[PDB]
Short mmCIF file of C-alpha atoms in Angstrom, two decimals:
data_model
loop_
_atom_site.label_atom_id
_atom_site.label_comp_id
_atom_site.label_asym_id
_atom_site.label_seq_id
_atom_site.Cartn_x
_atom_site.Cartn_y
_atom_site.Cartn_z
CA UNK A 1 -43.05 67.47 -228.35
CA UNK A 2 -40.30 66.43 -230.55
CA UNK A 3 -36.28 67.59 -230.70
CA UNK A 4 -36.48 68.82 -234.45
CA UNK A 5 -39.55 70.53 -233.87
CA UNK A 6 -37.84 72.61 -231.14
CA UNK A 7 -34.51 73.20 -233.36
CA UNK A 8 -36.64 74.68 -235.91
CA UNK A 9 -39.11 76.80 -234.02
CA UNK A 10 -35.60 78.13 -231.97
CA UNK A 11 -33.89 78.67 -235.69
CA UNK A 12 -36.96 80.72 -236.73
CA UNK A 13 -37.40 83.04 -233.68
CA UNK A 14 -33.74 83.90 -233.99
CA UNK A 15 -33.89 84.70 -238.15
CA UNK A 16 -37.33 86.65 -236.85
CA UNK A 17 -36.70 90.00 -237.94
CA UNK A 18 -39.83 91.62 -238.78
CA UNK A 19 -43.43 91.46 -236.92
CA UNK A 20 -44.86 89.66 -239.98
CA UNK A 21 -42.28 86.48 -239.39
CA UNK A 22 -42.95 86.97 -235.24
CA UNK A 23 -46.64 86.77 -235.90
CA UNK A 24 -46.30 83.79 -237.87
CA UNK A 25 -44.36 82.07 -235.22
CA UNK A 26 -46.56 83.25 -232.61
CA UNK A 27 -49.72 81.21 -234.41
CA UNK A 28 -47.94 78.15 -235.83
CA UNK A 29 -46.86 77.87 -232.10
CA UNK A 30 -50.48 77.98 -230.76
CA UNK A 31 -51.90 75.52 -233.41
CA UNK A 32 -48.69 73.15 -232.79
CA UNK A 33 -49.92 73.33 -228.98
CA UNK A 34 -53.19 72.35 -230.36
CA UNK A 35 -51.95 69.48 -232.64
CA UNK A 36 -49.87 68.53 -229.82
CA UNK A 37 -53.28 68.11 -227.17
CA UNK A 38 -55.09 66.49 -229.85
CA UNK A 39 -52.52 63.86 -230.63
CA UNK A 40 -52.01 62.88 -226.91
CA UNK A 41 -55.27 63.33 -225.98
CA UNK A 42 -56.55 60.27 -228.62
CA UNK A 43 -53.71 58.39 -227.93
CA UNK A 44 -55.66 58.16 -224.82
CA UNK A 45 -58.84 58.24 -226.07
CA UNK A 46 -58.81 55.14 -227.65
CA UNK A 47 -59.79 56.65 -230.32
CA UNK A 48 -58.50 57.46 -234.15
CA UNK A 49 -56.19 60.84 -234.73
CA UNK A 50 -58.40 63.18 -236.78
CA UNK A 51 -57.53 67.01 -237.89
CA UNK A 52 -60.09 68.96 -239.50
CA UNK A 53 -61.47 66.03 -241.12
CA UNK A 54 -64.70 67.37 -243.46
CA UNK A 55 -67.91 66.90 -242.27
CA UNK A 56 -69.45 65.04 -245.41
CA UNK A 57 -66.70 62.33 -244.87
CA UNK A 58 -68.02 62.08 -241.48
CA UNK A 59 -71.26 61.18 -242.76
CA UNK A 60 -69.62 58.65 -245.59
CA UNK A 61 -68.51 56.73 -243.02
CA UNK A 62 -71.07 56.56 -240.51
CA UNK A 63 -73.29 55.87 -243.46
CA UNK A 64 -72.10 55.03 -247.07
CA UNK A 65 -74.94 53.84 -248.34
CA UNK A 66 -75.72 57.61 -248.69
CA UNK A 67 -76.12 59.57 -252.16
CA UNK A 68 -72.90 61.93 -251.55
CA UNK A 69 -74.72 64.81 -253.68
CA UNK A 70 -78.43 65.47 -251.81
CA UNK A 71 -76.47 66.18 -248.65
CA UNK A 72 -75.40 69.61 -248.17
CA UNK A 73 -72.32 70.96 -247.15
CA UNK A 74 -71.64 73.26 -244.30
CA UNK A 75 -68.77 75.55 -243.46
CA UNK A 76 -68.22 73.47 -240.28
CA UNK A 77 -64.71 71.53 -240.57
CA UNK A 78 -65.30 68.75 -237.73
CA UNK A 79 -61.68 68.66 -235.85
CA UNK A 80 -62.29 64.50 -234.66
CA UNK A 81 -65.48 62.57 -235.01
CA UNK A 82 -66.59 59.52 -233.23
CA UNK A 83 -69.66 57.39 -233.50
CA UNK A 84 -71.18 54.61 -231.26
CA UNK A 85 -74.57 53.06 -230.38
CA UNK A 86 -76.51 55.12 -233.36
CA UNK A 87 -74.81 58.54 -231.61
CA UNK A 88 -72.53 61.25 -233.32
CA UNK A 89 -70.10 62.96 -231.46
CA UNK A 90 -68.62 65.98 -233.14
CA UNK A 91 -64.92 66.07 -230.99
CA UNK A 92 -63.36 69.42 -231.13
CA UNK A 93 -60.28 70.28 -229.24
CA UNK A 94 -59.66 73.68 -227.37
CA UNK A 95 -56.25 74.96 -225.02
CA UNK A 96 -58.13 78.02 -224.44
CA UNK A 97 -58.21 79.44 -220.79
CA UNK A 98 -61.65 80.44 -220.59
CA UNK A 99 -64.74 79.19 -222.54
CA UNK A 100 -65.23 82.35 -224.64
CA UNK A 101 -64.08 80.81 -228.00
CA UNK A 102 -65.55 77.50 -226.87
CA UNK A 103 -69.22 77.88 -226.19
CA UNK A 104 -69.00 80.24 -229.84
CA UNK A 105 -67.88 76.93 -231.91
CA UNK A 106 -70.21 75.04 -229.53
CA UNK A 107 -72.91 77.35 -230.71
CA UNK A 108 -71.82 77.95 -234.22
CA UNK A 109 -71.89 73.98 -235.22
CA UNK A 110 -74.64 73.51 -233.61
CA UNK A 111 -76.16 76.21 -235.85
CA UNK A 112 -74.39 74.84 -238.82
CA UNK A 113 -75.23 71.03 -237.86
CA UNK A 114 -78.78 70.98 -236.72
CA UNK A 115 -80.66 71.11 -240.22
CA UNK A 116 -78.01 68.14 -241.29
CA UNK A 117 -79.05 65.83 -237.68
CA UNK A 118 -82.48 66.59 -238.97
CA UNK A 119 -82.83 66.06 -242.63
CA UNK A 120 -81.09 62.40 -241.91
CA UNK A 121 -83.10 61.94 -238.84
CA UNK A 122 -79.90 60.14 -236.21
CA UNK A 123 -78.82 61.71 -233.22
CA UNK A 124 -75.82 63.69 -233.62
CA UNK A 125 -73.71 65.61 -230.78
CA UNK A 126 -71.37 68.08 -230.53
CA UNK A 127 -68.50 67.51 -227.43
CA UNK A 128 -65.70 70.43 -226.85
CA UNK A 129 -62.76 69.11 -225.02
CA UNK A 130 -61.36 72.52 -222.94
CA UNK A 131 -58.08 71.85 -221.59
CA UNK A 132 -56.29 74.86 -219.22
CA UNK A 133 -52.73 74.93 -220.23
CA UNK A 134 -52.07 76.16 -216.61
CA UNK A 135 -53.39 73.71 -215.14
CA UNK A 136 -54.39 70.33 -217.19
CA UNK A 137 -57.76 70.08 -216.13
CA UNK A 138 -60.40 68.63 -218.73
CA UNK A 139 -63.72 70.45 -219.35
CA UNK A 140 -66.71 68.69 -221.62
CA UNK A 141 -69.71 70.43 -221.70
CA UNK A 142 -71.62 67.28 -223.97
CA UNK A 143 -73.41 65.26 -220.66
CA UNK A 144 -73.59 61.85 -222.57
CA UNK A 145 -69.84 62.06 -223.54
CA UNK A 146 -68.97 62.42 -220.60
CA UNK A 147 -71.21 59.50 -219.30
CA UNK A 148 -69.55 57.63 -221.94
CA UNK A 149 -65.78 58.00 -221.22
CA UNK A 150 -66.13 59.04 -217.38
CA UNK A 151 -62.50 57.89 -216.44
CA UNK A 152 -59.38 59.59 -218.69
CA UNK A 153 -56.23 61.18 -217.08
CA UNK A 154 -53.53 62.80 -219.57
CA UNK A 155 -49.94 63.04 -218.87
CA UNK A 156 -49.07 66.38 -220.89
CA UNK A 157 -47.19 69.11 -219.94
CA UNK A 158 -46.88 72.86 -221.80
CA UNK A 159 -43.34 73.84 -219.96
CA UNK A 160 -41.77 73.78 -223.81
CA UNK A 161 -44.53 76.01 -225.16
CA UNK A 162 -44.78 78.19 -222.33
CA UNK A 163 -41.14 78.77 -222.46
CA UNK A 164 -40.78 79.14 -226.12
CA UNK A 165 -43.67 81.76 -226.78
CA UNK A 166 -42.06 83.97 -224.11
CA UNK A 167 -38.80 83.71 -225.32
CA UNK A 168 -40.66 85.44 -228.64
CA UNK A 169 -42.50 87.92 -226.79
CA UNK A 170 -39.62 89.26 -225.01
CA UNK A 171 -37.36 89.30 -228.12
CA UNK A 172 -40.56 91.45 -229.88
CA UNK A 173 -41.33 93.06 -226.47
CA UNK A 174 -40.46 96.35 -227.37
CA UNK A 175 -42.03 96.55 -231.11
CA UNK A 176 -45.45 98.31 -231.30
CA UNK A 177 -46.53 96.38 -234.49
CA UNK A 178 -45.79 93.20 -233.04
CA UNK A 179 -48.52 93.73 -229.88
CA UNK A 180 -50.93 95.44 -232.55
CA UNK A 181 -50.80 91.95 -234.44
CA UNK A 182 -50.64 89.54 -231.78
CA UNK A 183 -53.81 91.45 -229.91
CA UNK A 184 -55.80 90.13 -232.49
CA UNK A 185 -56.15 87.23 -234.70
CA UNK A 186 -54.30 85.85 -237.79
CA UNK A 187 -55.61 88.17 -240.19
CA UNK A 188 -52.97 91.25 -239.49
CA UNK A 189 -53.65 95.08 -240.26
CA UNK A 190 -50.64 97.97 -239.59
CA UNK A 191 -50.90 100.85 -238.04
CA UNK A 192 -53.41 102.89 -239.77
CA UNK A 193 -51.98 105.68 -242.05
CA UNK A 194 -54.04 108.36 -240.58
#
């Protein structure tokens, strides 16, 4: 976390006026408690800081010697990537309680990767790090990532986050069209007309 970070995020829940503005908090809140695990957690992965770094630069830099225009390009945006010993890991980073958005991206770049592992015949992965912000416990579903970095604690905390997201929800509490937005995702639709 950071001091100016907080300032700002406590300056924009008080200006918060509509459900629009709330909603807006709301996510920028959840993907700065994403940025936030992925920083810390390859500062102790040993590991380069990626963020939605695209795929076909992935494959640049494994392999440059590489015509850039036969290889297709997927819809998959690769959050951290990592290779070693002829092996691709595609790192992802989740904060989600429960696996149900998880195993989806799991499945959904392995959907959108497997013609690409093939058509350039090198074993490529996929590894989803699950944290609980609850309780920091670290779930990796790839077996051979796991055989590779066996040993890593983190030191993180989500006391900040916690706090601040409930200080939002109880301001917007009472509003209607602030639950109807924050029940579902980014994309937000009013109260219908009829």
């Amino acid at each position: 976390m950071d001091y100016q970070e907080y300032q700002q995020f406590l300056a924009r829940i008080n200006t918060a006026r509509d459900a629009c503005v709330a909603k807006d908090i709301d996510v920028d809140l959840l993907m700065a408690r994403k940025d936030y695990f992925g920083r810390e957690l390859c500062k102790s992965l040993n590991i380069e800081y990626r963020n939605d770094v695209p795929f076909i630069d992935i494959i640049l830099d494994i392999r440059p010697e590489v015509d850039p225009l036969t290889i297709d390009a997927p819809h998959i945006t690769p959050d951290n990537y990592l290779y070693i010993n002829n092996v691709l890991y595609i790192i992802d980073y989740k904060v989600s309680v429960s696996n149900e958005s998880s195993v989806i991206t799991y499945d959904k770049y392995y959907e959108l990767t497997r013609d690409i592992s093939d058509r350039l015949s090198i074993p490529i992965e996929i590894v989803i790090i699950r944290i609980d912000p609850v309780s920091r416990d670290l779930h990796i579903n790839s077996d051979r990532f796991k055989e590779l970095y066996p040993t890593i604690v983190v030191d993180i905390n989500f006391n900040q986050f916690f706090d601040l997201k409930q200080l939002l929800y109880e301001k917007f509490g009472d509003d209607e069209e602030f639950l109807l937005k924050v029940a579902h995702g980014d994309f937000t639709l009013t109260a219908p007309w009829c």
